[PDB]
């Protein structure tokens, strides 16, 4: 119940470390100083402390009323924390889960849905960030792993966030969908326009590129001069700039700051598709 959720270590290495405080509670009865100490060495994580010490309490040899004396422990890392600790250890079978699948170590999954639901930064810089520290070939599922940890995390006992908060993250939560929404339009795109055949280009900074245009409409051009730098050796501009149009036009909405910053994307990537395409004359 409590061990299962420790993501720091092998099974046995976990093992190795709960039934010494186990002994450094009923066969030797000694007092608790750097016990702290060794319980923090022993795991690095507050939500592993947290679970180590749970499962402390499911031993049958009860010396009386100490209880209170460990679980004052509990409540001492809690205490503050209770956002972190309470969302490492709801996430923590779902980070195991998609651990497996992605070939990723839970913990640092548990570190993503903690931030997640810690931090500020805003939907773009989300996705960019996800993107960046989990990989291209990643970034669709880690957004699931955030959604399937947010429906444990309401569903437990104890859950990291109250009603109002898991709104505000509900709602991001949204803002990330209707991104990855515009991010498989994109990508069918490229395939089409064979943008990705010759290898030359990467759907990878292709995808960030999108992504800076929705923070900074106003500066598309400038954006878009790194990949026209590429995309010259083997394509077209008018074939670049209407994969980023026809993507931007099929893509929700609400991605752009307002309907006006919208706008100011599709006019300067339209102007864009007739300067080049009219260059394309003079060749």
């Known amino acids: 119940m409590s061990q299962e959720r420790i993501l720091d270590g092998e099974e046995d290495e976990i093992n190795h470390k709960i039934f010494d405080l186990k002994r450094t509670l009923k066969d030797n009865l000694p007092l608790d100083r750097d016990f702290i100490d060794r319980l923090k060495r022993y795991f690095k994580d507050p939500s592993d402390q947290v679970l180590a010490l749970r499962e402390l309490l499911n031993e049958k040899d009860l010396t009386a009323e100490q209880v209170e004396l460990l679980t004052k422990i509990i409540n001492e890392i809690i205490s503050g924390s209770e956002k972190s600790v309470n969302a490492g250890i ?16 839970p913990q640092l999954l548990r570190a993503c ?5 810690m931090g500020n930064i ?3 810089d ?5 993107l960046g520290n989990f990989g291209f070939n990643h970034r ?8 399937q940890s947010l429906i444990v995390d309401m569903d437990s006992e104890k859950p990291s966030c109250n009603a109002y908060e898991f709104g505000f993250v509900l ?11 515009s991010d498989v339009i994109f990508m069918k795109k490229l395939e089409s326009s064979s943008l990705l055949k010759d290898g030359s280009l990467s759907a990878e900074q292709l995808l960030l590129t999108l992504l800076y245009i929705f923070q900074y409409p106003s500066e598309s051009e400038q954006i878009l001069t790194s990949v026209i730098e590429v995309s010259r050796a083997s394509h077209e501009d008018s074939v670049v700039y209407q994969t ?3 993507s931007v036009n099929e893509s929700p909405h609400d991605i752009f700051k307002s309907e006006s910053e919208r706008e100011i994307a599709i006019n300067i990537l339209r102007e864009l598709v007739t300067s080049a395409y009219k260059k394309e004359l003079s060749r």
């Open 90 to 105: 709801n996430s923590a079978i779902q980070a195991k889960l998609f651990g497996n699948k992605m070939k990723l170590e």
């Open 122 to 124: 805003s939907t773009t």
């Open 113 to 117: 849905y903690r931030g997640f639901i």
């Open 140 to 147: 669709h599922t880690i957004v699931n792993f955030v959604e």
């Open 244 to 246: 980023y149009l026809s």
């Open 126 to 130: 989300q996705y960019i960030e996800w």
């Open 171 to 181: 709602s991001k939560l949204i803002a990330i969908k209707m991104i990855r929404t």
